[PDB]
Design a protein around this nucleic acid. Sequence first.
DNA 1: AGCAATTTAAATAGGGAAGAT
DNA 2: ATCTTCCCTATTTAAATTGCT
Lengths: 929, 93, 295, 295, 295
Amino acid sequence: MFIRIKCFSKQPIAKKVSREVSAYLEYTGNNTWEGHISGQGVSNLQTKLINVGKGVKVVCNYQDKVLFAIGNVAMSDTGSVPKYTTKKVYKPDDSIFTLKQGLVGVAALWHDLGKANSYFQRKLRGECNPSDPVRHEWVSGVIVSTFAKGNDWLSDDFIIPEVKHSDNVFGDDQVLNAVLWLINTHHKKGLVEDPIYRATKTMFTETLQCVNVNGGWFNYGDNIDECYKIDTSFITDTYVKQLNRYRKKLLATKHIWFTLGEDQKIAILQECRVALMLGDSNFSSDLIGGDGSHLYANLDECGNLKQTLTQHLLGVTDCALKALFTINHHKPVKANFIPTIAEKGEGKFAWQNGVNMVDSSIDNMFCINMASTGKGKTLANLKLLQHFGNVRCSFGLGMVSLTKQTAKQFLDMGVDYNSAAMVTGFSKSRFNLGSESLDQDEVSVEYWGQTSSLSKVFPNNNAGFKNKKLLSAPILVTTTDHLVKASGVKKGNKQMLPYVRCMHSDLVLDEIDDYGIEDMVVLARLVYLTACYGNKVIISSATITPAISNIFYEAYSSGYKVFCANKQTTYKGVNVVWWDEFGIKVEKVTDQFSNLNTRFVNKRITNLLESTPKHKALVVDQDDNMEAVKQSITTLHNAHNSGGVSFGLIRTTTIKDCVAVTQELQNWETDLSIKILCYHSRFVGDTKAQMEEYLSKVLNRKGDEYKKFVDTTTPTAYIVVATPVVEVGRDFDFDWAIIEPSSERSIVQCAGRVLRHRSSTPTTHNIHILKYPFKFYRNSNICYDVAGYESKGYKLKSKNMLDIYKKESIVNSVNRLQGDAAFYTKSLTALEHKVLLDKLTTDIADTNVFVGGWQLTANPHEYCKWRRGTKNEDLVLTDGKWSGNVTTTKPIQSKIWRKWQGENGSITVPEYLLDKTICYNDFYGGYEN
Amino acid sequence: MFIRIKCFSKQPIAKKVSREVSAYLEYTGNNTWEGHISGQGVSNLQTKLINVGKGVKVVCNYQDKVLFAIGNVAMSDTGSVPKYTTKKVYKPD
Amino acid sequence: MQKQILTSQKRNMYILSRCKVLVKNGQVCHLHEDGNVYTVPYANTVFIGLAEGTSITNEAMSMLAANGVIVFWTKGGGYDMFAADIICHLPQADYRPTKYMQNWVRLWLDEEKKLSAAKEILKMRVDSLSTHVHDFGVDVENKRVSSIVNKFDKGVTQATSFESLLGHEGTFVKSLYKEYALEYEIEFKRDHKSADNYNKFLTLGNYYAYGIARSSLWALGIDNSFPLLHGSTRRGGLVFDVADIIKTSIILPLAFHAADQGMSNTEFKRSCVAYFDKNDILAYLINNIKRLCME
Amino acid sequence: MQKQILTSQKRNMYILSRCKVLVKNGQVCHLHEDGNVYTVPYANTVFIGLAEGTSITNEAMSMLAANGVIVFWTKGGGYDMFAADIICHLPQADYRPTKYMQNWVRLWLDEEKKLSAAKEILKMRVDSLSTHVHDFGVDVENKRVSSIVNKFDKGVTQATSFESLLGHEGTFVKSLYKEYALEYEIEFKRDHKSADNYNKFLTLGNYYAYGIARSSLWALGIDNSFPLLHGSTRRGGLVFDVADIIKTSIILPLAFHAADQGMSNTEFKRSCVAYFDKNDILAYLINNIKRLCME
Amino acid sequence: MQKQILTSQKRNMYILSRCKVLVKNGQVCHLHEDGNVYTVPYANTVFIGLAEGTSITNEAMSMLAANGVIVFWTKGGGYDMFAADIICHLPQADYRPTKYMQNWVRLWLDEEKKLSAAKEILKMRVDSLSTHVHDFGVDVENKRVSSIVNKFDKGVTQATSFESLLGHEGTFVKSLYKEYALEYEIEFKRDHKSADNYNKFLTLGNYYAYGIARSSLWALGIDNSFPLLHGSTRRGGLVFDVADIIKTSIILPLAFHAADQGMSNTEFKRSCVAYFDKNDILAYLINNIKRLCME
DNA sequence: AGCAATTTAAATAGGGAAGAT
DNA sequence: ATCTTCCCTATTTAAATTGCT
Ligand SMILES: [Mn+2]
Ligand SMILES: [Mn+2]
């Protein structure tokens, strides 16, 4: 590897970086180094070139592509190394940036006018309840609305009038309404409980007129008259001139505001709100010290009076203005040019040369990567990102362990920690034992990286470790919940960090089908927000349903419409890149996405069908599923075994179902040597982690290394009874599976856990589908709702899987890929597709995906909750002693193959099952006994 | 013929030679030019680099051997381009 | 004022994209829309090109023209199949050598002489293939390429009309483009309005070969307005004969290799510089028009 | 602290001549008498030889040894005829991995295991020949080299002692010296004291392969006092035993090509860096000596 | 400055600081800081050391190595050496490992001499305790310390395996730690990660002990990959095993005195090297390794 | 619009002195 | 001695402005 490093630096920051860059490369003179070094040498040079201080101006070239660029060095657009760069390059009708500046400046000088009431003064001094009857943002909004109703609010002297209690402060003037919504929602968004309003309201002001004081601001309301008697000590020199210059800025630019569309207004006001909380939290974090008394805004850690309200308003204004400037004029730090990506894929990765069919100069890209598992999907996503140049992306993945797997792939192929940042925000205690030096695994949290210039506008220089890893990451391999808060939050400033993260970075969401329906709705909201700033969305899901692919394209198309009309460019359409392991297709799609997507789906189906059938599923006829499991285990051991040894996966639905199947199979008298494992999610930290590592090392069938992790000498049935934790994110390979039916994507995923690593075709049948789910004996009205898309609004007419599924069927992604809306009441696949198009629809609703008008409100974050689960309290095992109503028990010790013990950790119990003892056990975790 | 010209001149003469050496070679940054030129191209570059005045500090490398060295530039004895140049090197009998 | 650098040994080669081209402090440079000023070596530049969002000034154009740098503008194509119109500023203030234009005129006006020159220039692409052999892509001396160029030479030998030359031209272009497609295992259709990298690399090489051809013609004073091959499909001037002498020998395998390896456009620019410089394709074209003119 | 680069993955190697090596602002740099201070990439350096007229401070050795750079001097016993003591300081402050010493000395003490290991390292000569081919010199697959490699293998298979081994070395090296010389049309007698380029380039490559071999030894912890070849003219230890794996495959073809193609000492030195990093010869010798000790 | 260290019997390990070593009038001298030159007699020295502020030249290096004066580079103090070559039987006449080295290897190989040498290294560690009596430290003749000594002597003499010797060695070492903690009125528990004065002072004193044991192992040519107590996978375990002899006899009382009076690190370094120079601790380790390896 | 003259100023290089090891 | 830190020391680059064509 031959590199060349050039320095642009002034100071002796052309000198103390010269020591480190002259420790690793030869000096060719004139502050230019050039030579041969290894990739780990590149990583070491990066780590000790960035850590040496601020102001390092370093460009590296590997062959002729730029390896890395330290700082905001413009470096190369076409040629490299410019001459002098001075000022005044373009200076356009910027319009919408002047609009955002005027809105943020006018609102930020009015965002805390409502702290001047006597209640907030005695709240800061501390002789009343610290919770206000009406929040000060609403009081400042009442001030601004009363001033606007009285005088002309855009060109007049200010003077705060006598204000009363107003239920609504939103009128008709679109720009005033924007300023009012920025003022009122500078801490939290208003929440609308009204069902008719949630049913009908769509527009900007027409929804904003329904935002009343009862949506969170009106806490208790007994001291309203003191909350609206206000002093007017803000009339000073610099506050009045700042208010005048920003109001006239808005006055001069609001003529382009009425030429915007609804989508524009929503996205622009979201940006304005994010910059306003950025400036407000930035000025509230630091201590300024000086004060002019008689009025105060915030308190220090000692509770003393600080940050008087005139200079508080001025500081929040300038900090929000500077926030806006750096978030709207940033050339963000991108990743290194990974040299182990750009070469050809060989063999089964040979489809990854589809990036040589995509244009490298497209400003936008919507990848739908429909490639099957085991083909290197995430490597192909990184290849697609690097085809357009240097990489800046957020790999948002479900589960901690899947982020760990993608991080380990990124580490061992070409990516160091100067470009990658693995973020899992829980600090799990799963450590690697055996040998620390001989590990060559366990990707960790260090991020030598490079701190971006956006950290100076965040509160108190961003944060410590976690938010520095969030914001400053070129490549952010993260759990997805660090990105879905970009679309907005209930309370606080947790929106700004993923918002500013997704503003300048691409978004790569892998296996989006494993998320929930509301989770997929907020993920497509994130896709729309990412496309709002021209970034590229890579979706990587093999079993995509047309509905999902369509609504994600429509979210990207609305976002790219926002980005196109935001830079005053005519919208040519979205560069959609359909991708699988058989080919690629790049089309400029502005309309008719459905026929092209279904034609690619049909081409992928015909490229999947002439291949040999790997998963032949038979739906059993035996009604009782206990003895159906027995007979199917006996049949698939007598048919599918490797010299007497067979691996079976009993995929069931819930935990007590799993322990019921386990306790039946343990007490089942047979000549077969059944060896039973329980693989559900309710387990203690230690025990769970141990199951994972063992299962990953015994079900690895790409080699014969497993022969030494199990007793393959004696003919044995190694059976793993598992819940849907096996069908998501597990690289497992079973000889056969017996599936309790809950949803068709569960069938396709548990087919993907059988012969995942081998290529031998089954002869007779490798999957035995149960006749009924076990909830049929508990609830015959609805049985597929647990881990399925059946529900109270979408009920199957019959629950028989002979009626709702094929008796003999080759299970692949084809049934999920096709998409059928008719006959959803008597087939599982059409039931699935129905729900997917009836929840992820092209409407705005309130919990929908095109959400417009409601982004202003708190409604999409309350009624569409990301990871909406049950109450979930956590019973914690502390050194062998349980906390709550747990009561350790003893398992049946009949056929347990492996049982790992646990002493620490915690189990997640729903509040429903907290009533009784969860009865934790070493073999199977939680049950009802 | 592929050459590389490095310049370590001071004063505005450094800028005046940059016009001529940027008329014939591409700019690789940090007062270093590098590119393909012809035989007589090198000559025209020599003729209008020397005639431009006194104080021109130009080293040219063809492949790895030094093509030319304008001035009394020490340039290369083994490696090329020094750093902390200074006085009192040898001082013998 | 010295020998002013002869055109065949000029080496630098650019197509400038999204930058206003100006002069700072003596030298011609281009300034992009981020503040970056990159200098143009105008004394050694063969041609510059101007893509979308480019803007050159007067004295910059003067310093290119008086030094003898042919300047064109890449956009202008508006049809569905053809690279329609490329606008090209000739440095005519340098008074050109004359008798090569007289020889080109005496072969252009005589119809049987134009046909004879049409013949030799059609086999000139055949010998271009034989001389300029790349290290990658196809091998020229395989059975399929030799069979098709043998059928092409046999058909162009017995040709007697320019429409027969246009038909045989079409079969030659279809034969090569598709054989390269087969080698690189892709499906190929030549559309100038396509997002596929094998196509816009071919249009970038169309612009590169256009610039090379006007520098070769202007070095001998030959105008583009004397097309020895003409037709309804083939209406671009003499640049659409001296530019596509070197498609299937130089550009099209280089475009397919660049679209197969799949980095950005700048490696393709630099690869065109490297192959036009190493094998002296400009001097090769000039010397071929030299042995055309005096025969 | 970091991984601090694996010593097989260091690519820079130097032999400095007529300079004062020192530390100036934490930089390993050699200063000549003309006032020129050239830095050295000490965290990427494999070795720094020091020729006549050289000098080095303490701190330069301190931060070369902390970065794992082997420093030797080309005088003393560096006349290369006796090859007794080329003064070669190693960084033993770093506590090296031990297991290669253990397997190496288990086979050393056992004389039959030493004889077998010597045969493996003698076969590594022809292995090096086959792996590292050169396109500017002797083809390895011609009849003379294949015949002499077959004769060398059939002689070293039936070998009984180290005196028999010493003789097979005479044959291989001397006749490969000669075979190159007859193909390079030069009457050549190997002489370390000779002035012709065919010998000064050979001694420079001897020092370069000395540095590569000694860095490969020290990497594994292997010293030099445990050689596999014992003889009257084989004074010098294990570093020459590792180094003469890559005379006739690398050092000798590069030296012969250099002399024939009139390279200067500087470019021969560089040609040596290019071959030692393009084929990754340091990792080759390190992995192959792991194959040698192993059990 | 100029510093003399007796090592075996008659040869002296010269340590040179703040001086420039070169050749004047045909023999090796060095200019010192005061501008006064000092020569060196070749007969009385074999080891010559280059401390901080010291540069040597090439012909001085060559003439020093041709006179049997083998040079090493060390951190200032003379007992923190980072660069040297390997002792042979003779520096010019032949290249053989030293008798001490070979004896060590043979003793290490056969399991019985390895066990006997492990017992012996602990016998001489108890001897070291008594031999090097300090003033500020605890009395070695005290009843508790003598009971610990006799417990260690019984445990080493009655043991037949290495892990028993490791448990007994840890018991003795931390029992002396406990005794010195009982002296200096502190709760002392040995951990490397603590930032208190006693633990970090003992850590850097242990690093000084590792340096002087490394010099003593190098000076008889003993390699750093044959530990007696520590495992085969422990990198540089023989340095730790030899430094164990003086860790609890010299480093521990000096470190506890240094943390008791609380002075800084450089003056603890000068106290450690003053104790090394005054009582000839390196010469004690040299004679210790001779008596171990000779048996 | 490019440039030139010409100021203005920020920074780069170097030498001497003193303090560390 | 070697090397580092810092203070002169002024020498040396980059920007800035502005008539002039
Ligand atoms: Mn507030
Ligand atoms: Mn505030």
